[PDB]
Structures are given as structure tokens and as C-alpha cells.
Chain A
Amino acid sequence: IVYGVIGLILIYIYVSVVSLLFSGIDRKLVARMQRRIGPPILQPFYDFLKLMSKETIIPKTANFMFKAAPILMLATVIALLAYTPLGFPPIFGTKGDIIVFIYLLTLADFFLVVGVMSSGSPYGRIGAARGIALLVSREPAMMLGVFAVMWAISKLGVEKPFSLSSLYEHTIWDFGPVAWVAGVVLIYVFMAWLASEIEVGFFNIPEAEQEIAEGTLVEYSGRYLGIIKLAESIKEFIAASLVVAVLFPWQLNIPGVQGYLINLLLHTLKVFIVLLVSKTIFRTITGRLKISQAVNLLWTRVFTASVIGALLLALGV
């Protein structure tokens, strides 16, 4: 049990170093794509410190949740790190532990919306009802794909079914010729979910657009803003780690007490290659859409393809 605390502290310090550095490389590439020098590489490690520097402002009409939601957001991200596949099988992975993952990946955004909406002026009230419509609209699209693949990798035999430690035993890519089509339909629905969860591209709706550019987080000002800008970057790393876990886990065997860190580096490199397409290219190449058009796209051209992929992969076994 005490050997499960050392991992939860050390992997947290590792991920909190790496994620901001990936964000800095991303801003440099986006700046070079349109004829610019761009900021230096470790630029977020200055913005974080100056946001912790300043004077926090509390409005006169504010609850006890204004000062306590940017604690619970970071808390349910740090507590989510212990269940994620970092390349080796996770620490607390038992027979359940998929619904705990889906529940805690849903619950952080609800803490964010409750923290924004629990203030005064009604810019936050309009910038929150736009948030939860997009939250409800993007999570029947991943449940079907992940439940279909977790059910289908349990036919050929495993001892911890419906668990993320079971996803290193056997993958999709050895079910025969018909699975090669479900592979690309599932690459489609997972890239669409990964772009719509970290909210960049078409789906840059509730962040820097409250009627022009006000945003959802128009109100948090001091320490609280620094904590929220850290927590969203850790969640950026977590969701892409899930996407590279389901799609193609191809790690080395390499027994010993140092094959763990080699597999950890190889997983970090695959995370970088998956972000590089989605976030960078899809941010540079396409603007916003709308909210009434961002809802009828995730129920028509994403959720439909999940049903096609799940049904076609069910007709392979």
C-alpha cells in the first residue's frame, strides 16, 4: 500500500514537468507555420509563476464554491493519474476500473462548470449552459467504442476483464481481414473525440468565445487561474494516453527494474506523435464553428460511425 503512494507522487511530478513542455513545443510549431519566430520553448513555466505571483480578487457576490472548485478539479485529476495506462499496467487496476475512469473523466468538467457558474454576473451563466450541452453531447460517442473493444478483447482470454490492464494482452489488429476496416472507422471516432475533449479546432466553443472573446473563465484572476491552466494541461495528457492505449500498444518486453522507464519513454513519444497531428494541425487549419452546429455534428457524423464500427467489429467475432 505504501508502495502505491511513491508512484502517485513521482508520476505526478513527471507528468507535471512534461505536459507544459509539450504545450510550449506546440505553440512554437504553430508560430512557425505562419512566418514568425514565436516564444521560447519553456514559456509556460514563466506564465505559471507570474499567475501565482499576483493578487487574487473575490467578487462580492460569490459562494463557497468560487474558492473551492479549482481545488477539486486538480484533486480529481491527480486522483485520476493512478488509474491511467502509462505504458506499464497501472497501479490500482482491478476487475472494474473502466467505469471509474469514465466517471472521473466526466466529473472534472462538471466541477469546472459549477465553479464558473457559482459567481455573480450572467456572462458565466450563459458560458455554462453552453458548456454542459457540449459535455452531454460528446460522451455517448466514446462509451460505445471503448465498451465494444473491451468486450471484444475478452473473447480470446484474459483474467481481469473490462480493465485497462487487460488491454496489453491482445489488440484489435489480430482478428483477421474484417477488423482492418473497423480499425480505420475507430481511428476516425477516436481522433474526433480527442479533438472535442481538449476543445481545439472546430470545437473551440466554451473557452475563448462568450459572445466575442470573453470566454468561460472570464472571472478567475490570481492563483486560481494558474491552477486551472495547469489542470487542463494534465487532462490533455491523460486523454491522449487513453487514445494511444486503445489503438496501438506495441511495447518492448525487456525484463528488469529499468524496462519500466524505457516503456515509459516509448509511451511518451507515442503521445507526442498523436498530439502533433490533432492539436497543432487541426488548430492551425480550421476556425470555430458554432454551438447549434457543434451539437448536430456529434450526433450525426461521429456517433453514427461508432455504431457502424461496433456492428462491423461484432460481425468479425
Chain B
Amino acid sequence: MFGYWDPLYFIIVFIIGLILAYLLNLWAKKSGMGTREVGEGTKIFISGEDPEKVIPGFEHLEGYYTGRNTMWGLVNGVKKFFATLKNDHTGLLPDYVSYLLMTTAFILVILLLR
């Protein structure tokens, strides 16, 4: 698509970028203090690992990567699409057999005419 040797320059500029960006930490670790390891998250400092005065944390989140609604007229059609397709896959053996039988008949009927 692009060039003939052009996907080989991309690696060159990417590696020289990583060399500069890692050299900067290699400099800045020397001048200045070191590190340490604390844990509370700096996140609502009242509690880190406690039990009960009122209810508290540890109600962890699942995979919810949607917090928005466009025109709020597409989510209903998407759910009505996924519902039928989700409960098509029953799991009974005559479904398997009937599917391959009607596929064979479909290809035969088309190939006879044209």
C-alpha cells in the first residue's frame, strides 16, 4: 500500500523514539530521590483496608464499557437484534441436521437453473 521498503522505516523511527524516551528516565532517576511503595490509592483517604462503621468499598466493577447514548434510538434495535440471535442457538440435534439439509437443497436449486 505504502512504499516497498516503507514498513521498515516505521520501526526505525519508533525505536529511536523509545531510545530517547528511556534515556530521559535514565537521566532523571540519578538526579532526584528514589522511589518507595505505599498502598492506599490516594482515593477517598478515609479508609484503605478496614471492616465496618457503615457500608464501604470492595464492590468491584465488571466489563461495562458504555456510558453514552446516541440519539437514544439505536440501543433498542441493537438489543432486539441480539435477542433473537442469542436464543437461536438452542442445542438440539435436529437443528444441526435440518440446517445442513436445507443448505444442500438451496445450493442444488440455484445450480439447476443458472
A positions within 8 Å CB-CB of B: 1, 4-5, 8-9, 12, 52-61, 71, 74-76, 78-79, 82, 92, 94-97, 100, 119-123, 125, 129-130, 132-133, 137, 218-219, 222-223, 226-227, 291-292, 295-296, 299-300
Contacts and interface: CB of A to CB of B under 8 A. Distances in A.
Contact of A71 (B14, B18, B33): B18
Q: Which of A9, A12, A52, A227 neighbours the largest number of chain B CB atoms within 10 Å of its CB?
A: A52
B1 interface: yes
A120 B31 CA distance: 28
Given A96-B3, A120-B39, A218-B43, A74 B33 contact: no
7 contacts: A1-B9, A52-B31, A57-B36, A75-B21, A95-B3, A121-B42, A227-B24
A74 B20 CA distance: 9
A219 B43 CA distance: 9
A223 B28 contact: yes
Main secondary structure of the interface of B (DSSP, over half): loop
Interface stretch (B59-67, B90-98, B102-110): B59-67
A287 B112 CA distance: 69
A52 to B, nearest CB: 5
- Leading 9 A-B pairs by shortest Cβ distance: A96-B2, A60-B39, A121-B41, A121-B43, A78-B17, A295-B68, A79-B17, A55-B33, A75-B17
Nearest to B63: A129
A310 B77 CA distance: 28
A71 B69 CA distance: 34
Q: Which of B9, B10, B17, B24 neighbours the largest number of chain A CB atoms within 10 Å of its CB?
A: B17
B32 interface: yes
Interface of B: 1-3, 6, 9-10, 12-14, 16-18, 20-22, 24-25, 28-29, 31-44, 60-61, 64-72
Nearest to A60: B39
B68 A292 contact: yes
A296 B38 contact: no
Q: Which of A53, A58, A75 neighbours the largest number of chain B CB atoms within 10 Å of its CB?
A: A75
Contacts of B21: 71, 74-75, 78, 227
Given A8-B16, A57-B38, A129-B67, A71 B61 contact: no
